[PDB]
Amino acid sequence: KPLLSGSIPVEQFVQTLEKHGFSDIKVEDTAKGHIVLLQEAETLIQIEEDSTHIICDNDEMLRVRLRDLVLKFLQKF
């Protein structure tokens, strides 16, 4: 796999989640980042500087979907 770099803007990320069929998306603020909350697989997406952490139940199709959308905001080295 390639090294990744870049940032995930939370507004844009949420908008693309909606474009891809997710609804009722909730967003918390943290000290400098955000957490996106989805009912699907009780998912948290922690969005911080140089760090994205997807925490979800074992729903591989859901995880792959989020993985792919996150990767579209990053550069691949």
């Binding site: 796999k1 390639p2 940032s7 140089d50 760090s51 952490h53 925490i55 995880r63």
Partner: protein, 104 residues
Amino acid sequence: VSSEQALKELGLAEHQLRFTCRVHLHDTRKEQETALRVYSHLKSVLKDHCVQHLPDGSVTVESVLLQAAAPSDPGTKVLLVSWTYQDEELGSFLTSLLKKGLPQ
């Protein structure tokens, strides 16, 4: 140019993309027994890989980390499986594998 040189040449930091999957397993044994059963199963199935049972009872397969969650319900163990994007194939493989449970 390599991948880290091509990052450093642009002033950029690496972005860590991390996954933690909450795997549910039915086991009425103590969680430590569960973790041992998980370790033995993975060591048998993934013979070509580095598979470890660490002194805190956690399990690893290359750099994929498998840990007990905090004890729940007494018959359900949650195994937090965590990996970064570097190990994406291995990580999805392991969560897929554990969907089928463990040897009897």
